[PDB]
Amino acid sequence: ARIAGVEIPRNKRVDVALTYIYGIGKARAKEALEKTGINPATRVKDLTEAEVVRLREYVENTWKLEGELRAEVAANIKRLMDIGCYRGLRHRRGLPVRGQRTRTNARTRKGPRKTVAGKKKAPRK
Amino acid sequence: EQYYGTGRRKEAVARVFLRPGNGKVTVNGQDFNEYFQGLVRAVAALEPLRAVDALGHFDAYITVRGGGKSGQIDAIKLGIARALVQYNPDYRAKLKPLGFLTRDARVVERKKYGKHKARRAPQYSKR
């Protein structure tokens, strides 16, 4: 509990729990458990306060986590928005950025479908 | 010294050498179950013996090469049935009506073009 800022993950295995933190995933979980010596398997509620500190002292003092990340990412994007950059423009319009197609199939970045009219004088559609 | 039959099944070939004795079977330098470990079907490769009362009257040394384990299980069921018949040609009328002597012609069917999958026809629209 309170392993990263505000992050209280509880009651699951400690390796799963840590992933409930922002800049922390299957990897860094595995890692920070090795480098601080806590068994992956133990439930979070079954943790020595002395262990929860070696965790916090590591995770918190060794990577950019939580809002401290979300902050950088946000300014990392405005960065290429301020300059003329092409990826910046794509971000500005809210279209794919990694050279994907946009004729079909861009829904996840585009959002839900903004349907318009079909024909004026043509076949059945 | 021993008794032999071949026996094949769907790209898998069994070599069955029968010797007299106890009942102990060894496929590919391994105990029977060491190989076919926990496959509900395995016991069925020995139905030739289980139906000539040869349970514990024969030992068997087998090598099997090809395909996958369930096909090998059938190839053995022939090899055993075939060796058992050059051991005793009177065993046929016992064994033939159970079919153990009929090699299973059923083989994987070829992939055709403009199909997905030898028969699986690709799906179409507007009709």
């Binding site: 300059i83 950059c85 092409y86 | -």
Partner: protein, 80 residues
Amino acid sequence: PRSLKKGVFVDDHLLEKVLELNAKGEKRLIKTWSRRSTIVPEMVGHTIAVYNGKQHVPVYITENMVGHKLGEFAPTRTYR
């Protein structure tokens, strides 16, 4: 996530051009068709007119952009 392992490719006919514009002054507008060319620190300040397929475009090179690529600032297509 991009590449060029060791060599950091920069089109050199432009490079000999820009380095030679630093014996003295910084010529306004440089006409390149090598959008293909990585930006380097020794380009800050000048103005490079990158093509387009259709027109050279006045790309004021700052220092925020010292690593990117010239074609990253000459947008090709015209949309709404």
